[PDB]
């Protein structure tokens, strides 16, 4: 079902949460080699989550589930906000700009925290 697909997509999102919080500890400790690897892992995780979400939104559209489509439009938009901040973070790491990396990291945390009530609302809607 689209609901199990959303639970499967949510689990991937939570994997990225885990690798992010590990990445944050490594950044604070100055273990740049670990950070590089975690950033690659996150890129792969976010790329998968985005594709899953897009499939869920298409299926909800084909099913005519207007409320779920509304929420998935809202949530996917926020996803891109978090994604763009992530990409700027990766660029800050490449550039050696730890001040920017810290800024983007905190912003990505807040964008993620805000979007959680909506994430829960989608599970119930599908």
């Amino acid at each position: 079902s689209v609901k199990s697909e959303y639970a499967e997509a949510a689990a991937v999102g939570q994997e990225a949460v885990a690798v992010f919080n590990t990445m944050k500890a490594a950044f604070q400790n100055g273990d740049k080699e670990a950070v590089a690897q975690y950033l690659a892992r996150l890129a792969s995780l976010y790329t998968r989550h985005e594709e899953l979400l897009n499939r869920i939104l298409e299926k909800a559209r084909r099913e005519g589930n207007k409320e779920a489509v509304t929420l998935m439009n809202e949530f996917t938009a926020t996803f891109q906000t978090g994604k763009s901040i992530f990409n700027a973070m990766v660029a800050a790491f490449k550039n050696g700009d730890d001040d920017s990396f810290e800024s983007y990291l905190q912003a990505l945390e807040k964008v993620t925290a805000k979007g959680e009530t909506l994430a829960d609302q989608i599970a119930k809607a599908l």
Side-chain angles (χ1 to χ4, degrees):
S1 67
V2 70
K3 195 171 300 184
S4 61
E5 283 144 24
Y6 187 71
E8 292 150 20
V12 173
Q14 284 310 106
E15 200 181 316
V17 163
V19 179
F20 174 97
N21 284 332
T22 304
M23 175 281 292
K24 172 187 188 176
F27 167 71
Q28 293 174 354
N29 293 328
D31 185 352
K32 306 181 71 173
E33 294 201 34
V35 172
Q37 282 167 267
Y38 296 133
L39 290 171
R41 190 75 166 186
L42 289 162
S44 181
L45 287 167
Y46 291 139
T47 293
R48 169 68 163 157
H49 195 197
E50 177 179 346
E51 200 266 319
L52 294 176
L53 293 164
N54 282 340
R55 286 156 41 170
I56 292 169
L57 172 59
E58 292 144 20
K59 188 165 186 164
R61 280 177 186 153
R62 291 194 303 273
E63 294 181 338
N65 185 340
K66 287 196 185 70
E67 182 58 31
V69 170
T70 297
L71 301 170
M72 283 289 304
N73 293 332
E74 291 183 318
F75 186 87
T76 47
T78 299
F79 182 95
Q80 294 290 318
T81 304
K83 187 192 170 173
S84 293
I85 293 176
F86 177 72
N87 286 341
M89 194 175 65
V90 175
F93 182 69
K94 178 176 182 196
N95 282 324
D97 185 354
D98 287 354
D99 168 87
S100 300
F101 189 94
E102 299 146 4
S103 175
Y104 292 130
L105 188 148
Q106 288 204 28
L108 178 62
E109 279 176 340
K110 291 165 191 168
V111 162
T112 303
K114 293 188 164 69
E116 281 332 297
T117 60
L118 182 52
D120 278 22
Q121 288 178 222
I122 293 166
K124 298 166 183 172
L126 284 164

